[PDB]
Design a protein around this ligand. Structure first.
Ligand code: GSH
Length: 212
């Protein structure tokens, strides 16, 4: 019965969330559904021994759906948006084609040993290719409503705004007229606003993950 979820505790502050935007996806779909769940803050620097019985890689996120474990957040989202008591949302439209390039390229932006100044010249055209069709639909990165492309990207855009803001506060121009207003929606709803990490505890989670 029920839903139990294991998620990133902050570095040094085990009672709050820190850097794992992949955990923030799982909170986002549960809070869009408003469905009852139970959350377990895992310290990744000192992992509970029983946590390997839930996640064989020792990673977060991992969940229990009806007490049965599921790891990796794109698989966890795939099962939650297909096999749950609230309506299923596992429908990827055309926005998943560009969004699946943005998905790793915005993690590589936060790991830009390979220059971000050269990478950004592709990211502006990735954002234009998404935004040019999203401005026909209006509100969300999957179109008229939240589906898999918001669940793939929404916490990663807020994580870029915070963690890239610490050294290269990269502006979204008003020509990206969906993207620049969609970032303001991350401070709203149950689905985005409840999932917002403490912003120092994103930055102090992300620094060693420029390397690791
Ligand atoms: S976010 C911190 C690490 N998790 C992941 O990177 C999850 C990637 C998956 N494909 C996903 O769920 O989407 C993590 O748990 N690191 C362990 C550590 O010891 O820090």
């Amino acid at each position: 019965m029920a839903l139990e979820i294991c998620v990133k505790a902050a570095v040094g502050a085990p009672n709050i969330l820190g850097d794992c935007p992949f955990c923030q996806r799982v909170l986002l779909s549960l809070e869009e559904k408003k469905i009852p769940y139970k959350s377990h803050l895992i310290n990744l620097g000192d992992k509970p021994q029983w946590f390997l019985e839930i996640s064989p890689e020792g990673k977060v996120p991992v969940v229990k759906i009806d007490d049965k474990w599921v790891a990796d957040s794109d698989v966890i989202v795939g099962i939650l948006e297909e096999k749950n008591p609230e309506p299923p949302l596992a429908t990827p439209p055309e926005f998943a084609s560009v969004g699946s390039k943005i998905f790793p390229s915005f993690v590589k932006f936060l790991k830009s040993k390979d220059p971000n100044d050269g990478t950004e010249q592709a990211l502006l055209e990735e954002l234009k290719a998404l935004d040019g069709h999203l401005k026909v639909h209006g509100p969300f990165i999957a179109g008229e409503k939240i589906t898999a492309v918001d669940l793939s990207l929404a916490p990663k855009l807020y994580h870029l705004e915070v963690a890239l803001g610490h050294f290269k506060n990269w502006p979204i121009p008003d020509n990206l007229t969906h993207v620049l207003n969609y970032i303001k929606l991350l401070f709203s709803r149950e689905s985005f606003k409840k999932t917002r990490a403490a912003e120092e505890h994103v930055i102090a989670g992300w620094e060693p993950k420029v390397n690791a």
